[PDB]
Symmetry: D2
Subunit: 499 residues, 4 copies
Amino acid sequence: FQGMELLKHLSQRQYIDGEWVESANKNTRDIINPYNQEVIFTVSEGTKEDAERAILAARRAFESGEWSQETAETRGKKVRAIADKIKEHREALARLETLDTGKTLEESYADMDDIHNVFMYFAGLADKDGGEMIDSPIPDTESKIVKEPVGVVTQITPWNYPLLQASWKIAPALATGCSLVMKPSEITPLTTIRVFELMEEVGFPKGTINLILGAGSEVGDVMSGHKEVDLVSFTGGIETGKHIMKNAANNVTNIALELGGKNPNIIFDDADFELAVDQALNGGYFHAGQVCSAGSRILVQNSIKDKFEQALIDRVKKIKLGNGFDADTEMGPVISTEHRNKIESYMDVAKAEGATIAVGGKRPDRDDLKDGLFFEPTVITNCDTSMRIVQEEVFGPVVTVEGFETEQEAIQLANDSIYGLAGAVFSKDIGKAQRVANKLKLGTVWINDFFPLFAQAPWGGYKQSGIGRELGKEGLEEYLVSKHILTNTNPQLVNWFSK
Amino acid sequence: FQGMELLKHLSQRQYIDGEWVESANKNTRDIINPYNQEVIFTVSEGTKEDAERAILAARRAFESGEWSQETAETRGKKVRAIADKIKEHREALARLETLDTGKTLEESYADMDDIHNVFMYFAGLADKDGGEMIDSPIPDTESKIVKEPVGVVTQITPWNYPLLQASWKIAPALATGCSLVMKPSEITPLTTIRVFELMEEVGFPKGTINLILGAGSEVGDVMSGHKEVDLVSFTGGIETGKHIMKNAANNVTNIALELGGKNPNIIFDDADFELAVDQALNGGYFHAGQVCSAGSRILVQNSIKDKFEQALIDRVKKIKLGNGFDADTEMGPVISTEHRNKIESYMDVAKAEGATIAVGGKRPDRDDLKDGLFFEPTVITNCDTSMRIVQEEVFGPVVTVEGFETEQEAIQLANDSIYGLAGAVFSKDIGKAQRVANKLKLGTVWINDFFPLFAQAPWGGYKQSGIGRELGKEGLEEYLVSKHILTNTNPQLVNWFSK
Amino acid sequence: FQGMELLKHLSQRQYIDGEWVESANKNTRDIINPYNQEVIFTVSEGTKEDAERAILAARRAFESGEWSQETAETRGKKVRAIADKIKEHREALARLETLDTGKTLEESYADMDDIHNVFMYFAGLADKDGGEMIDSPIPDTESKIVKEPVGVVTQITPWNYPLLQASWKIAPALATGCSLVMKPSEITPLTTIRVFELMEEVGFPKGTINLILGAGSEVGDVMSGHKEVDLVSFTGGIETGKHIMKNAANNVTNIALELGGKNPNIIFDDADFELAVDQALNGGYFHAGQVCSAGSRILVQNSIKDKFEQALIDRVKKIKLGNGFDADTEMGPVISTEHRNKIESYMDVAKAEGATIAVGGKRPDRDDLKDGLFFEPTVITNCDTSMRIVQEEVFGPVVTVEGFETEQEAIQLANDSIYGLAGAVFSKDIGKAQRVANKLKLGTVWINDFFPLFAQAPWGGYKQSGIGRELGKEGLEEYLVSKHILTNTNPQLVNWFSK
Amino acid sequence: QGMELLKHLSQRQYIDGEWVESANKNTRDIINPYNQEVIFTVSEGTKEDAERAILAARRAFESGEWSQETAETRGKKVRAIADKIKEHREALARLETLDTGKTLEESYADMDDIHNVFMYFAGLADKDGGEMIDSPIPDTESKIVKEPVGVVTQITPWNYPLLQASWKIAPALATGCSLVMKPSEITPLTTIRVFELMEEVGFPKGTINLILGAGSEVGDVMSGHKEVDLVSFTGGIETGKHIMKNAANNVTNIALELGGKNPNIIFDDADFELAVDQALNGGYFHAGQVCSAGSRILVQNSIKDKFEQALIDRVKKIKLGNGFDADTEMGPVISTEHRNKIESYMDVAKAEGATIAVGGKRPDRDDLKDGLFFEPTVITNCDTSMRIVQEEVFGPVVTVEGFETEQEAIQLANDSIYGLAGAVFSKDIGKAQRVANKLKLGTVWINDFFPLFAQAPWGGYKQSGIGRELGKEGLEEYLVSKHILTNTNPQLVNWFSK
Ligand SMILES: NC(=O)c1ccc[n+]([C@@H]2O[C@H](COP(=O)([O-])OP(=O)(O)OC[C@H]3O[C@@H](n4cnc5c(N)ncnc54)[C@H](O)[C@@H]3O)[C@@H](O)[C@H]2O)c1
């Protein structure tokens, strides 16, 4: 099959306490290629005991200090060498990801560029701020705040952008001096396995980094609830996130949650019309709409609603579907039969509550798409804010279209959801765009663009799209804890109690 | 009775959406003075629907923008007007707090001075950091982060220092423009009711501040679990904390937890001895040990242990118990019969597992204390880290004493608990105190001192003593949320999808 | 006037080392009211030995540490007391400023409000940052940066906005713990004398604050050149600033300079026309253009140029000149015969090089303005960037009008001067306003507004408009110096040199 | 000996992307201080070459190819220079030792530091664009954007040519400024090399420029030209005063890093052997030609005599020789003029009643006669009123003074026009900290001497300078703030009659 050579030397095992090792029970898992449903690889399926052992090794390593007591400058140099290795093997990593997740090759190349930059950013931030000096309000005292690594941290990622979500958590952890245990989505472990071999070549002490492979239903709880864990950085669906928070509570453990969204793409009548159409398509269908920042909820002003529906619909009929390795492919398949069915059930929900499937809504007929997990890019019209298809995250190549009369009605509709991750506003009137952006309860607002995000700036949600932040200085602040040391430079007896 | 004048004009009601109102079911509760167990006041015992009403009132107010959109400079002027009212009524407040909680009048004066200072600090911080500008990695884009108020916030406090703990939550909330709903310990609401009366006089838009009165076992779940709350700031026991975090997870709601501690007080043989004895007494018996920062776990170096034990014990026999208002009084009563019962049960625990009650460990015998909730300052010896009396937070006028041979052993013991709030180190060798300070997993560390904490510096725990911080800039950030606004100054079509 | 009452209790003396004292040689100076040219007051004219003595007192005090070593919190409380003194006495101060400088009362009330806010802003910034903790690249070392008060600072202000300019220097100086010696313009000392009376009431240690009254030509070289001066903060004309810098080099003394401006006011054809005219007038004739932030150089797009000129000209004819105390007055007189003379000489220079005096250009003939130092609001047309009238600062009620075709041309002209203090831009296309603002070499840029400046943000020049900043956090940093204290926690011999 | 390095080294200046000769074809011979022999010949630039350089910097800066490049990319480029320093570590270190005469091990320390300086600023490039202010005016957005200052001129001394050059180049490039640099006329070698290296990395035409020449011929143009936005100068105080004065003609910002009279304070409760070791190190590394040298030793009276005895006895054993020999502990001083300047101070010291306890002259040994060597010296029986104690000698010389108490030590240490760096030795850390706080110095070392790194700012209090180098503060010298205030609901004032 295609991509076969990339897998010839990849590890099938987990990585615990400095060694590549199997599952405690030698159980394994088959890895699927959503383009043809062929098994392409077989990796270990760790037990909860393996996860426990990894966590304990992380703690043991953290306490020894080899990495936590290493200078911030040096840690930065090592995070920077990881970055150099991403770029060195950019070609192989990009394919590996396309093969595992199904997105076009061009999309996977874009990630290796971001990933390189993500580690590169944190490598440079490592030695830039160790805390602060406070002007004490008590005479003859010195007051200071030192920032230390939180300790041991568990990192859990989703299947849509595996190595990308991994790097967002890995970079700051290592930059701060923490020891980490990571578990990628059970269905997309390929690139995460590669990066560990890469980090291993860079050289880290035994137990600083550990990789667990397995179902979240079996090892997850261990990772969110073990008492030696100080931080749990999770990226995934909301329900799994609530589970995690409640279990983390058993030992009052900090969390950082990066959940889903119902991201609005607000289009005013004075917008660059062809740009708005270009970006609606992009927002709704890159990686088959399996993107947490996908613009699945299009809000379009009534004056141009009709025209907008026609243009969008006509462009969607031309979207090329195929293998990610094919140069023509604009949109790939969805990740699994489970996920595909999930999306299919949403078409029945929509139809049954009053919405119109304007186009798509089914599997591709074609002779060259029948064997893959493809689903037609779709547009839903005649829907409103009370419908489940509009309120809930479908996480597929689906978008809804709602109209608004005014600027107030646009904000009202965009903020009318449990989520608050990201969104955009298209308009040539920047004063109006800036007004709107200020009233939107979103972690990230794009004015006349859709998708841009980078290490220099924090990413995360308002409301139920999350807790905490990733990337930028705040992304780093998650892996740090503050200690206030107050010295009394002229101690004196208080003499409150009798003598 | 002694403090009658203080209550002849005090309100007995809840404060919701600009009005002083009773409970939904006219239910009420009696508040007592722990020095004599006399009922001194009757207030409303509100319901969960009242709580829901407050939360909704705070939500409306926040969305109207009357406080949330007020300039940060003006918000700061009003927080400063509150600080001014604390100082203006300083006398009456300290007396009120002492009447309700039993602590000495001098301690209550100290609180009032800190409360003024807290509001003043945050009044002063309101307008200094609106967020940042990012040098964007994408040409022709403007990247910026704006810091916004988090929204509606619920604030829950303990009975030990009611107003002090309330100030730490109210000040930053207002400073940032959030709407708040507060509920103090059901047994100590007097000073909290008072400060609401004073914040009313300062002047705030309807629904911006709200006071709920009632048992947390009845109205607490609403304040932690309602979908409209954006943050729950909690200061109390660990189990209530875990219960709250699990509940807040139902709507992925931010939590800030300030829990208890098992604070070590380390005393080296090269420490100023009379200084150590003085601060060990203060650390152990201020407010009868009903203090989250109490130095309940004394670690003394073996070469001076016997000498230390007898001095400490000799001084404990001389501690003057009595009424808070009386100047000669050095230690007051404990808060309730339930809490004294809990402390009595710990003496039996200590004895059952092999420890020695070297002094105290019972009710005082004197005739004038017979009616109050007094319990003798106690010193427990011949104990170790495997015992419950050493591990668990007694929160009474009780300290345990353990020995250590070396520097490595003092630290090991100090970190051998699930907590990590605060601690102290006593030694004339400042290099050594600093080494030790750095390995101590505590939020705050005192070198040759015990207790100092002020608005200028963050406070909170490592491990299970908490999540997040109060005071300082970190404290302010719990009430703020970051939004990244990216503008494409030269938007261009991507043309990924076929035309 | 009703304002001669303001003066019956005002000090006529200098303030040195805690005492109100006369000149060393008892010399005096007569102060003038520009509306009628009458001598309203008489004060001490200090000698160069009085200045030397003031600086020596400020040094003595700084070293004793009564103020420099006081807590930052307490310093902030005092700066806050001064701010309250400004508000209490707002009325009297505003009248006094109008009496002394000729501007309207409405303008002086505005200054007093700003002034209050300046002291308040800095009171609150005082205790917010004492330095940083650095993560050292050398093992077994601690690295911290402490911010200290820079020491003794001399402060020199201009005659246009005496107290305002003084507030900008005093506030951070006292907040950071420095010692200051101030000298206001010799012709406008009234408000400055008053504010020293007020600062004395709040109470500061002897030496901390010092007031010298006198001609810069006599005592200025001592304030810039004495070796005990650590910083020299000057606000005045460019030629005096150059002289000062050169003098400060004798002892490598730090400098902060706020010089003049040739501030452009850019008006695109897509601007709100009536807003543009309103603002062009305001920027042009507030305080008879005797403003360092005055929009003297109007740049207007060609397509609306004729229409704009005519519109501006018609409005200028109606400007009402008179007494600053009369409510009908829109623009008062200029400061002195000398200053008026300078402006007049500028009308000749303009004419001889080919510009047109489209309106104004002379003293008003009117009967009630006859005895005053008035000068008609003027508009100069048919001018270009090579002309002196356009390149140089007139500092009068005069503006030059120049056309531009494109966006690049406006940017090129706006930036074609030796200056770079401030500027504005008017256009309904906010996108375009941002592009322009980015390319203007100016410390402050206004989009659709003119004159806004406040304590929360830094003010100062680019190019020859100055060195350093005033206001905001950067304003405070002028009064601080950094110290890297590096401690070696495990000192070891190097053994480079033989035994 | 180290002939091989120079074989392919450029002899010319670098202006507007071309390696070019002086306008008047003039040249200058470079010397190896160990043997006073001519090792290389370079161009002697004119002041018009300097004016041409500056005008090129201005053009490039305005064209925006570097000033408007993303901060992230600029950072990657600074990192590429960092890497070339490591790549050529060996050569550069031999080259610095050949030109300046210090030991090879010192030159290695420099290159490691130089790598880390570039690396640090490469990492700081994109971390802070400015800030959002909470405007007190309703319906207004307020933001402070940080922009590159403009054209910057950079001038360095002969003691640590490349080290001092790196402290200026790194932040300039990182922020997007354009530059024109001039090294000391006698030590231009490694600076010419670092330019050949920067050229291989790639920067647009005009961004970086190198002028070669005497400060008394081209220096005024670099401090006084009106197109210059900032003057970053590291050198002597007197030159410092001159430059500031000239820079004032166009109100041009300046950063000054000047000399010091750094105190090395030793209390009786210090680790005695640790204090003797570090006193030798602070006084004689690079033959005391270090801006951070501990030339003013202050020792508590109770151990003063003991310390003098020990120090002197150790100074007598200091190995003098060729910087290329592993045995050499101290090399020669830089030039004939600098050695005579030090000799004249010996006369001054003896004339004012001080004692030359040991050293104070050239060494006679046959193999050291052809080099610019001067014996490590120790001057006793002196006081704060004397010149030997108040002025920067910059030779291998120390002065020893006694102090009875903590206050007297503090008083003497601050009793100079300077305030750059200093040390405090004592096992009592509490005491070291009270002292550190009261010393008016840019950097204070507790129980150590010399540490300084990119992570923390370096500069002086009092007359040791204006501004800072290194750390975030050193970057801020190359940036200027712009307050952009937008009114989002403008309304007419209607002050003036319609
Ligand atoms: N906020 C963001 O930055 C962001 C980015 C990408 C994706 N997402 C979201 O992530 C989701 C991706 O889908 P997914 O199916 O991978 O998410 P998921 O919630 O199904 O699972 C994600 C990860 O959690 C693990 N897991 C499952 N149960 C667990 C448990 N009890 N304890 C611990 N771990 C457990 C899974 O094995 C997997 O590794 C989408 O909703 C998308 O919106 C968010």
